[PDB]
Design a protein around this nucleic acid. Structure first.
Lengths: 411, 555
DNA sequence: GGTCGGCGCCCGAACAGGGACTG
DNA sequence: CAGTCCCTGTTCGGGCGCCG
């Protein structure tokens, strides 16, 4: 008996028509049990081929989670409904969430099943369940309620969400609560003990309205990866050549970098292993360039109207560096990940883990998910990335093939 | 007109477009009798109904012969209706494969007669399926009908029938969970581990369940004894094989004959191991006419003779046993060709295949092997829903060196090394640090966009030097030619300093084959070396001799 | 015959995006 | 400076195979 919020696509843009990719046996069995249960609860309903729209579907298991979780790749549908959840029913991003000592994430996706969906918009939430060896044709469904993983679900439920959080925000005014996709980010400067206690208070405060796990974060301990020059006492031709190439590349970000006096040391056709003493004018150019790398880049600030872009570099030995930016060489944040799951054995698991960590930080700091430039072949990524995904959202990505230049971001 | 027991599928036209209005083709008098005989019978059965002048729509219609039968099939040229009809999402995601079938006690196969004619069309959509049937005389106005069922030739007919058929089979499969039903269009593969007595009972229950909705299961297409003819295979209680494939024996080969030859060789490669179509596909490149006669090359004639000798022996595949692991083993066949076998017990192949797609201008065997593993994995998840364990002709240390040092993310699933020559290895390794006591070559080259002329050469720390003039070349080709000179005129250990990102980006990928002959010559020189160290420095910065030589290789 | 849908392969032409050089 | 072009990679259009 709830009124439906009317939702439309962006003008001059048809619904999503993305094919379903093959799924493993453990994923198909989990999707059939969930969909049959969801159809029994009226959350979804079967459809036919007269609906020309479709969205891929697969299943995941979150970190240390035994229960399967249905996930829909609504990235194409979210691109075609962008004006709804930004212009009309936007969610403000709290700039203090990134400053909390501890931030916990809660999957509130089960609450969206309580609100019905607009009848005219249900045609676009269509999805197909595949069968092993194509035993049976596609078993198609469509959503009758607010689907999990659709950017229009938290916007419609936002009014209902604020009224549920109002008694808790009043008792705890210093706690910051942000809602992105099917997740709820709760941050507080309390001690780690009383923090988890307040989380359980919010869990029971949400259970009494019809809604369970938790994933902790610590944004105050997030570090950046600056550009560092080696501290050698004896320099060879090969050392200074790599140093000049690194400084020449870094000059695109810090315009004050000079390589005039340094590249003068490499003027004779010398052997690479030959030791070269640094001139007086070169020792000053190096120390000054070290000081410019300590300074912050001039004119770098976040623009809410621009999309975020994240580049990742494979440094080997389980090392992975990354940079977030909106305009080239105007990096909003840099960093490096090390010793993640699958280190020294599985590159795809490490890359999947890195993308999840980066996207999570992008939500806490700016409330956006970046578009990734992944250092991997398209066929390699699209084969294994679903095997290691542990998040309810999916960022956009493209595939790059940039051979290593002068190892800029890692010594 | 009576109401069909099957629920109809609501179909619309695309917004802002009207039905088809096309004139009928001139038909032969032998096809006219075949259509009037069928149209008068379909009208009696309620499948088509007469229409008057109030229907302003019309579409062409014809008929083709049925294979191995005197009956004719009615087809409608709905090419104009398909353009203006709404888009449909096809539910047929793929084709079933016998290797994915499990051993069942009893097996039954049946086909529904006239499947499309047993499923009704939308009531509001029957008006757009209007056609004219010409008479034996051109002056006769002709009889005009409209379809009450699914017409053949419409772009929505297969998608509608596949979904409507599944909805009828859902209550039966809900009551009989242990019965496996492979539904592909109208072909039904029914199997169960029930005893042969209760099996035929469930079969007759299904033939009556389908009968309640207007689906007839004739005993002509009924199959109770092996071998079963299913999806173009021969299903035996313990093995399976494709139906006999016939290759043309043309004395003169056209381009279309090779396309039919390659098409059946690819279809045969799923169970016949070792099929190669490398030299036969080299006959299709750069050709324009389908009817153009092309002679067979010596490498193509040898490849065809080997494929014909493989097809002489009988091969068979087994069924899938979920209790045992899945194993896939790959072999390096030719330059750019790969073959694999998926099996659970040794020499009892579930299916075979091949991979030979050339990706990029420069590559190595490790890249091509990784691409093959990915093609096999996706193919395996389609058929069995799991990834097999791989037996790869590559050393564990060889792969370990590759993926740990590559700048791209790359990975292979759980695999083990099989010692089947030829082995996939890396042919050369670029040192990580500069070589002490090795001559240092500062290369680089340039060219002119207009004259297409350029120079390429090097200067070393020992005073060695060379500059070679080049004609009809580019800036990229000269930078490669410079490194090739440094390799040619150096010892077994050499340090090479370049400023070409392009040249460096190709060599660091460790390719062993390229489409450019200059790259292959650089590869051949790298294999002869013992220690090679490349290094990139920015240009126009006055860096070492790389500025002194950049002035020598300016013009 | 010159109907429809699905999947697979092989090819070339059109598209497209980055790097070095030039008015 | 923006304009090319040299290069490489991708995407799609069209032929065949196979099934219904």
């Amino acid at each position: 008996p709830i009124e439906t919020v009317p939702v439309k696509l962006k003008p001059g843009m048809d619904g999503p028509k993305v094919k379903q990719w093959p799924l493993t046996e453990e994923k198909i069995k989990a999707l059939v049990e969930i969909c049959t249960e969801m159809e029994k609860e009226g959350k979804i309903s079967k459809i036919g081929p007269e609906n020309p729209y479709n969205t891929p579907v697969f299943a995941i298991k979150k970190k240390d989670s035994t229960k399967w979780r249905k996930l829909v790749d609504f990235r194409e549908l979210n691109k075609r409904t962008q004006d709804f959840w930004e212009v009309q029913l936007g969610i403000p991003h709290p700039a203090g969430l990134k400053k909390k000592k501890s931030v916990t994430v809660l999957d509130v996706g089960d609450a969206y099943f309580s609100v019905p969906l607009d009848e005219d918009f249900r045609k676009y939430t269509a999805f197909t369940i595949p069968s092993i060896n194509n035993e049976t044709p596609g078993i198609r469904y469509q959503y009758n309620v607010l689907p999990q993983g659709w950017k229009g679900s938290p916007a419609i439920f936002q009014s209902s969400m604020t009224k549920i959080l109002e008694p808790f925000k009043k008792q705890n005014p210093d706690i910051v609560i942000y809602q992105y996709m099917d997740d709820l980010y709760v941050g507080s400067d309390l001690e780690i003990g009383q923090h988890r206690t307040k989380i359980e208070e919010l869990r029971q405060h949400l259970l009494r309205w019809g809604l369970w796990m938790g994933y902790e974060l610590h944004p105050d301990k997030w570090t950046v990866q600056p550009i560092v020059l080696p501290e050698k006492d004896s320099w060879t031709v090969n050392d200074i050549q790599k140093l000049v190439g690194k400084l020449n590349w870094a000059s695109q970000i810090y315009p004050g970098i000079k390589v005039r006096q340094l590249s003068k040391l490499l003027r004779g056709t010398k052997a690479l292993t030959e030791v070269i003493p640094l001139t007086e004018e070169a020792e000053l150019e190096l120390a000054e360039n070290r000081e410019i790398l300590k300074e912050p880049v001039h004119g770098v600030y976040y623009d809410p109207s621009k999309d975020l872009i994240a580049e990742i570099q494979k440094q080997g030995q389980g090392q992975w560096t990354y940079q977030i930016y909106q305009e080239p060489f105007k990096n909003l944040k840099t960093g490096k990940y090390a010793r993640m799951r699958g280190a020294h054995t599985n590159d795809v698991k490490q890359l999947t883990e890195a993308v999840q960590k980066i996207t999570t930080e992008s939500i806490v700091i700016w409330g956006k998910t970046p578009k990734f430039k992944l250092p991997i072949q398209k066929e390699t990524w699209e084969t294994w990335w679903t095997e290691y995904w542990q998040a309810t959202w999916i960022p956009e990505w493209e595939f790059v093939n940039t051979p290593p230049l002068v190892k800029l971001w890692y010594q | 007109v009576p109401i069909s027991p099957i629920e109809t599928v609501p179909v619309k036209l695309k917004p802002g477009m009207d039905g088809p209005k096309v004139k009928q083709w001139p038909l032969t008098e032998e096809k006219i009798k075949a259509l009037v005989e069928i149209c008068t019978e379909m009208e009696k059965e309620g499948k088509i109904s007469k229409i008057g002048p109030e229907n302003p729509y019309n579409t062409p219609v014809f008929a083709i012969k049925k294979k191995d039968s005197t009956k004719w099939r009615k087809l409608v040229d709905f090419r104009e209706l398909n353009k203006r009809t709404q888009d449909f999402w096809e539910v047929q995601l793929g084709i079933p494969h016998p290797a994915g079938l499990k051993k069942k006690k009893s097996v039954t196969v049946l086909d529904v007669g006239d499947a499309y004619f047993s499923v009704p069309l939308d009531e509001d959509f029957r008006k757009y399926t209007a056609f004219t049937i010409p008479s034996i005389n051109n002056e006769t106005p002709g009889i005009r009908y409209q379809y009450n069922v699914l017409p053949q030739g419409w772009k929505g007919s297969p998608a509608i029938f596949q979904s409507s058929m599944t909805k009828i089979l859902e209550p039966f499969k809900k009551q009989n969970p242990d019965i496996v039903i492979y539904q592909y269009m109208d072909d039904l593969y029914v199997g169960s581990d029930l005893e042969i007595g209760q099996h035929r009972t469930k079969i007759e229950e299904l033939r009556q369940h389908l009968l309640r909705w207007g689906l007839t299961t004739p005993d002509k297409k009924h199959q109770k004894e092996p071998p079963f003819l299913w999806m173009g295979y021969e299903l035996h209680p313990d093995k399976w094989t494709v139906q006999p494939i016939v290759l043309p024996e043309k004395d003169s080969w056209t381009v279309n004959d090779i396309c039919k030859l390659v098409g059946k060789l690819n279809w045969a490669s799923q169970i016949y191991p070792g099929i190669k179509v490398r030299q036969l596909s080299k006959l299709l490149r750069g050709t324009k006419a389908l009817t153009e006669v092309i002679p067979l090359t010596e490498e193509a004639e040898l490849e065809l003779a080997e494929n014909r000798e493989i097809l002489k022996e009988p091969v068979h595949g087994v069924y899938y046993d979920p209790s045992k692991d899945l194993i896939a083993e790959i072999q390096k066949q030719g330059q750019g060709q790969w073959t694999y076998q998926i099996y659970q017990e040794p020499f009892k192949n579930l299916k075979t295949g091949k991979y030979a797609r050339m990706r990029g201008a420069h590559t190595n065997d490790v890249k091509q092997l990784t691409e093959a593993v990915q093609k096999i994995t996706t193919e395996s998840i389609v058929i069995w829903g799991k990834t097999p364990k791989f037996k790869l002709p590559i050393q564990k240390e060889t792969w370990e060196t590759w993926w740990t040092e590559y700048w791209q993310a790359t990975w292979i699933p759980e695999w083990e090394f099989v010692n089947t020559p030829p082995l996939v290895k890396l042919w050369y390794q670029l040192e990580k640090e500069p070589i002490v006591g090795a001559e240092t070559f500062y290369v680089d080259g340039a060219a002119n966009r207009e004259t297409k002329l350029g120079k390429a050469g090097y200067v070393t720390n020992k005073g060695r030097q060379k500059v070679v003039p080049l004609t009809n070349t580019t800036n990229q080709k000269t930078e490669l030619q410079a490194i090739y000179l440094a390799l040619q005129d150096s010892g077994l250990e050499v340090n090479i300093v370049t400023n070409s990102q392009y040249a460096l980006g190709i060599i660091q990928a460790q390719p062993d084959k390229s489409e450019s002959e200059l790259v292959n010559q650089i590869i051949e020189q790298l294999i002869k070396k013992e220690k090679v160290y490349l290094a990139w420095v920015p240009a126009h910065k006055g860096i070492g001799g790389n500025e002194q030589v950049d002035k020598l290789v300016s013009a």
